[PDB]
């Protein structure tokens, strides 16, 4: 069931669009969101569709998995995987406060391109 935390409809019923969609259900508490509503992307939506995703309230560092220094955690808005900027492989300073694509998507990126 669940519903988008923006319209509170469902993954087959948009409350603000009157049409079906597919929310993002957290694998910790169980709250959902419309990808289009979260400003998500296809890789993120797709990613989060098949795996955990975990709402931001239950977030964590795929790297650590403690969400401790979330002040550094990087929310790859391309699957949701969170990494403390200083946890990544090619660490960053702050910049990915929104975009970012983590290593999963990236290596998938480098592979995607041609």
């Amino acid at each position: 069931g669940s519903y988008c935390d923006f319209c509170l409809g469902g993954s087959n019923m948009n409350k603000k669009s009157g049409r079906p969609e597919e929310l993002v259900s957290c694998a910790d508490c169980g709250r959902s969101g419309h990808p289009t509503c979260l400003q998500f992307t296809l890789n993120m939506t797709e990613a989060v569709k098949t795996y955990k995703w975990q709402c931001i309230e239950c977030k964590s560092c795929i790297l650590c998995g403690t969400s401790e220094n979330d002040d550094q955690l990087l929310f790859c808005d391309d699957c949701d995987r969170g990494y403390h900027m200083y946890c990544l492989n090619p660490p960053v300073a702050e910049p990915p406060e929104g975009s970012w694509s983590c290593h999963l998507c990236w290596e998938l990126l480098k592979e995607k391109a041609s």
């Binding site: 400003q39 931001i56 977030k59 929310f75 949701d80």
Partner: peptide
């Protein structure tokens, strides 16, 4: 650079 925020996104800002 602005704090308008088209939606909210993750990041969790105190609950």
């Amino acid at each position: 650079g602005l704090g308008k925020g088209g939606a909210k996104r993750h990041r969790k800002v105190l609950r």
